[PDB]
């Protein structure tokens, strides 16, 4: 009853990410708003740590499924919902093919009524004159899907998916993402069977900002049950 109420309207967001990648320290702050009723999110990320070595498309995947559009027939398979304002944590591993990996911890909750997202990142095992990081990949994005599976061992879920980032020369990079999602409280959280979640997004620039900026709007919604 309560876990679904906490998204009745708009929600302002504050996303902080602190990462260490091969001697490169970085902090990222993102500002925007979201609505779960339509699975819509609209954000703008900026790095107050100067020029960054990894392309912006990399940071996109690793920056709130609690906002995905959920229908009335999957009111019983919304794991992220039942835990509000309980919140939850997720541990994600992203694995690049033909380069190294990222280990990223994230804690998601409500703070007052603002959704603040604290994320810590450790990315290593890369060649620093490569393409995935050496700014050879194309500034774009594509439509993707996430598979969520129940996990009674952690009485939460696992989320697995695969992202394909096209390079400016036709080639693609397939990053495989795992993550464990677990709620902080011992309360009863609604258990979703394994199903999928479609996601679309778009990247753009502000015309009159002199820092490094990345504006992004996105639509996210789940499915998987062939209900009546």
């Amino acid at each position: 009853s309560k876990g679904e109420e906490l998204f009745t309207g708009v929600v302002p967001i504050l996303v902080e990410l602190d990462g260490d990648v091969n001697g490169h320290k970085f902090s990222v702050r993102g500002e925007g708003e979201g609505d779960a009723t339509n699975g819509k999110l609209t954000l703008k990320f900026i790095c107050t740590t100067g020029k960054l070595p990894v392309p912006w498309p990399t940071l996109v995947t690793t920056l709130v499924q609690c906002f995905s559009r959920y229908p009335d027939h999957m009111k019983r398979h919304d794991f992220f919902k039942s835990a509000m304002p309980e919140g939850y944590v997720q541990e994600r591993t992203i694995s690049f093919k033909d380069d190294g990996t990222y280990k990223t911890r994230a804690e998601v909750k409500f703070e007052g009524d603002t959704l603040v997202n604290r994320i810590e990142l450790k990315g290593i095992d890369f060649k620093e004159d490569g393409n995935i990081l050496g700014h050879k990949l194309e500034y774009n994005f594509n439509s993707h899907n996430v598979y969520i599976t129940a996990d009674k061992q952690k009485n939460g879920i696992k989320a697995n998916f695969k992202i394909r980032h096209n390079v400016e020369d036709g080639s693609v990079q397939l990053a495989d993402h795992y993550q464990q999602n677990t709620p902080i409280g011992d309360g009863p959280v609604l258990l979703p069977d394994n199903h999928y979640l479609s996601t679309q997004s778009a990247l753009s620039k502000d015309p009159n900002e002199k820092r490094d900026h990345m504006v992004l709007l996105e639509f996210v919604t789940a499915a998987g049950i062939t209900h009546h």
Partner: protein
């Protein structure tokens, strides 16, 4: 200067009233480009958008994300705001960065009445976003059931009208070919009738003008012409002038039946211009052709043909020349 936007967001209609009465910024561009009209449309507040439009707001206000008050209003679900925005000059075919049009969002969210009012104002049903989807796709991948049905009906109406116009083009080309055959039958030297030949050559050329008119029409509508094979006439030997006139009569009647079927189709799918075109250029010529060819047949039958030479000779001399 800036203190009006939070009152619009909180729904303080009286506060924005008294503060806009005093000289205030109506077309305010804010920290992310959200004008008071955008926030007045997100939340359902008709009074605020009315008093903002009256004071000179812009209905097309390019947000930093590419949105417009019509986008957010169609996504939310408030019908009255959609109506008052459409009457004020909102553009039904404005795009996001993803490429969504207000009908994309109306179909995703599941708002039937908003879908109707957007279809009445000129939203197109097969428009795509960057990722290639049409409103019917966003409707069928989200369980929104009736949006899908009322958009499928329109997709099908357009497809069927295109197909019927192609079939009419082929039918008139076939009739032209049949008349050419008829005409060069009466040119043999064991069939020495010259004005029968001129008659059927004239009809052969008129029937090609008829088909070119329909090709031009289908290019004006934005459809695709798809030409096909033309069958050969059923006979090479049209036994006499009477039998050829009767065959032309049956052919004209078949063509007229096809025109009537296409007119009923264009009437079912609410297409006034197609109906007007059909009855202006095609339904009064068929009636006159059928009347004239039946006249020829009864004249020939009364004079005594086909068992009478000097009946077709004198018909050819006096009526056809």
């Amino acid at each position: 200067g800036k203190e009006l936007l939070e009152a619009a967001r909180a729904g303080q209609d009286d506060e924005v009233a008294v503060l806009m009465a005093r000289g205030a910024e109506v077309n305010a561009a804010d920290d992310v480009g959200v004008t008071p009209l955008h926030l007045a449309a997100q939340r359902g507040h008709l009074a605020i958008v009315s008093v903002l439009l009256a004071f000179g707001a812009s209905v097309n206000a390019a947000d930093l994300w590419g949105q417009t008050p019509l986008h957010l209003a169609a996504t939310a679900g408030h019908l009255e705001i959609v109506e008052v925005l459409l009457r004020s000059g909102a553009s039904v075919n404005a795009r996001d960065n993803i490429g969504h049009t207000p009908l994309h969002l109306a179909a995703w969210a599941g708002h039937l009445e908003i879908v109707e009012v957007l279809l009445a104002y000129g939203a197109d049903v097969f428009a795509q976003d960057k990722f290639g989807k049409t409103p019917f796709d966003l409707a069928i991948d989200n369980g929104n059931e009736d949006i899908a049905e009322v958009l499928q009906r329109l997709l099908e109406c357009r497809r069927d009208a295109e197909a019927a116009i192609n079939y009419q083009i082929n039918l008139e080309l076939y009739a032209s070919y049949v008349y050419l055959s008829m005409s060069y039958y009466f040119d043999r030297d064991d069939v020495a009738l010259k004005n029968f030949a001129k008659y059927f050559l004239h009809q052969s050329h008129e029937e090609r003008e008829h088909a070119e008119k329909l090709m031009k029409l289908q290019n004006q509508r934005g459809g695709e012409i798809s030409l096909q094979s033309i069958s050969s006439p059923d006979s090479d030997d049209w036994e006499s002038g009477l039998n050829a006139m009767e065959s032309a009569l049956h052919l004209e009647k078949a063509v007229n039946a096809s025109l009537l079927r296409l007119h009923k189709l264009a009437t079912d799918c609410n297409d006034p211009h197609l109906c007007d075109f059909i009855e202006t250029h095609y339904l009064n010529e068929q009636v006159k052709a059928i009347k004239e060819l039946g006249d020829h047949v009864t004249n020939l039958r009364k004079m005594g043909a086909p068992e009478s030479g000097l009946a077709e000779y004198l018909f050819d001399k006096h009526t056809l020349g």
